[PDB]
């Protein structure tokens, strides 16, 4: 029973190394799998958060825009004037206007630090019959390009309204 | 010494109890994962039986409609001395062979009649030219309205 | 010593019972996850078949409509329905050109012609009596052989 016990001892030692190590290899995967599950869930939370952000920004922008159009529509009904666009070619920004007489206004910046607006009138689409309808209502000068300080602007506006 | 031994057997017995407790949770969780399947199985069973009736009922209505159609066709042919063999749809227009004078009719509304004598015994082909006009023996074209009228002309001559 | 032995004992006991439960639960549950799949496969099959069973019945029925629709354009005659009251089947009919409703019964073989005027504007009923032999309106009876002949007679008068 002496030799047999010794034989048993060696076998036990061999099996323990073989099954233990295999087990260690296995536990490592168990601990690791949980960790993998843990990081993925966190990643998922962030994505859902980022999605709300995008959805909420899309509603607030689509909601604020509605106001952009409404107001534009108000001013048209209340001031008989609509501002179509805006460009900024290097020096000066420009807006097309329709008040019917279409024209553009440009802004001067820098220099004596006071804004200067340049008026040119654009009849991109016109029928001569109107162009003479208009020359009868409008001082000849408005058509030619002009230049005044901002202070004078409102004054301008009024002159054109009165004549139309 | 027997001091430390006792402490071991006690620490080994503690964690073992904890392991058993952990084991119980697994079973308590299983029985649910299994009962929730025995309901999804049931929905499928209910759905499958429903889908089976549908197929069976469609098979009877189709086999029932087919019979009626056949009957009608037969009746017509008989008490009509005129039978419609087939139907093609080459691109533009469908065609039916008809049957004694065989011919075909095309539909593009407007109609087209063409004689069909691919095969005949000359003796008949002259039997036929004596009962019917030369124009029929040529392709023709009339509005649908005129069709029944056509039919009658051919019957009267035959 | 007796305690530590009853403790660990109970522990191992629960363990074995729990392990056995786990071995059994896990099988009773995997064998369901296969029956779920078979049901799923069958459903998908039934869906294809059903969908493909709706067009053949419908087109076929629809095709009959095409056939029904042809006959109506070509024979100035439409068969509304069909009953089978014990002895004999019956079909309503409407024949004529933009018309005389009647029914035909079938009971060797033999036929029965009755005229249906359940509803009419007298103005028509006299328009009709001027075009139609007085006799067609009253119920009649002839062998099948004579049918087509009948049919012609009514068409010619309308």
């Amino acid at each position: 029973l002496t030799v047999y016990k010794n034989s048993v001892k060696q076998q036990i030692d061999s099996a323990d190394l073989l099954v233990a190590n295999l087990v260690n290899e296995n536990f490592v995967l168990s601990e690791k799998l949980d960790t993998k599950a843990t990081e993925i869930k966190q990643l998922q939370k962030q994505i859902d958060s980022l999605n709300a952000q995008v959805k909420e920004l899309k509603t607030q922008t689509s909601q604020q825009a509605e106001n952009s159009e409404v107001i534009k529509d108000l001013y048209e009904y209340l001031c008989n004037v609509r501002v179509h666009k805006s460009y900024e070619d290097d020096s000066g920004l420009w807006f097309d206007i329709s008040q019917i007489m279409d024209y553009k206004l440009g802004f001067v910046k820098g220099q004596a630090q006071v804004t200067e607006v340049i008026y040119a009138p654009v009849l991109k689409q016109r029928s001569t019959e109107e162009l003479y309808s208009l020359q009868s209502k409008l001082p000849e000068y408005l058509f030619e390009t002009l230049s005044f300080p901002l202070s004078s602007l409102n004054q301008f506006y009024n002159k054109i309204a009165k004549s139309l | 010494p027997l001091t430390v031994y006792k402490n071991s057997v006690k620490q080994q017995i503690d964690s073992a109890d904890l392991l058993v407790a952990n084991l119980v949770n697994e079973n308590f969780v299983l029985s649910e994962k299994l009962d929730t399947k025995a309901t999804e199985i049931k929905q499928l069973q209910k759905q499958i039986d429903s889908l089976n009736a549908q197929v069976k009922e469609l098979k009877t209505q189709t086999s029932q409609q087919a019979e009626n159609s056949e009957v009608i066709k037969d009746l017509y042919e008989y008490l009509c001395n005129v039978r419609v063999h087939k139907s093609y749809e080459d691109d533009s227009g469908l065609w039916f062979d008809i049957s004694i004078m065989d011919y075909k009719l095309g539909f593009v509304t407007e109609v087209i009649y063409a004689p069909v004598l691919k095969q005949r015994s000359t003796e008949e082909l002259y039997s036929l030219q004596s009962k019917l006009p030369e124009y029929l023996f040529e392709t023709l074209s009339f509005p649908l309205s005129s069709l029944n009228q056509f039919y009658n002309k051919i019957a009267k001559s035959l | 010593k007796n305690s530590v032995k009853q403790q660990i004992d109970s522990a191992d006991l629960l363990v074995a019972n729990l392990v056995n439960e786990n071995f059994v639960l896990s099988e009773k549950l995997d064998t369901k996850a296969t029956e779920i799949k078979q049901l799923q496969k069958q459903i998908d099959s039934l869906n294809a078949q059903v969908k493909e069973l709706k067009t053949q019945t419908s087109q076929q029925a629809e095709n009959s409509e095409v056939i029904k629709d042809l006959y109506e354009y070509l024979c100035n005659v439409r068969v509304h329905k069909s009953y089978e009251d014990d002895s004999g089947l019956w079909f309503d009919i409407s024949q004529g050109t933009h018309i005389m409703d009647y029914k035909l019964g079938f009971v060797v073989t033999e036929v029965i012609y009755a005229p249906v005027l359940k509803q009419r504007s007298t103005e028509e009923l006299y328009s009709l009596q001027s075009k139609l032999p007085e006799y067609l309106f009253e119920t009649l009876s002839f062998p099948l052989s004579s049918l087509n002949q009948f049919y012609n007679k009514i068409a010619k008068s309308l």
Binding site: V23 | Y5, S8, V9, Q12, S15, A16, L19, V20 | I8
Partner: peptide
């Protein structure tokens, strides 16, 4: 987890076995 738990439980049952075997070793030594 399960694995770890099982191991710890069996390992504990082993320690006891070892202690028992020792109790006899001391006796043999006597």
């Amino acid at each position: 987890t399960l694995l770890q738990l099982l191991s710890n439980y069996y390992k504990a049952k082993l320690d006891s076995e070892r202690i028992y075997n020792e109790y006899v070793q001391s006796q043999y030594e006597f």
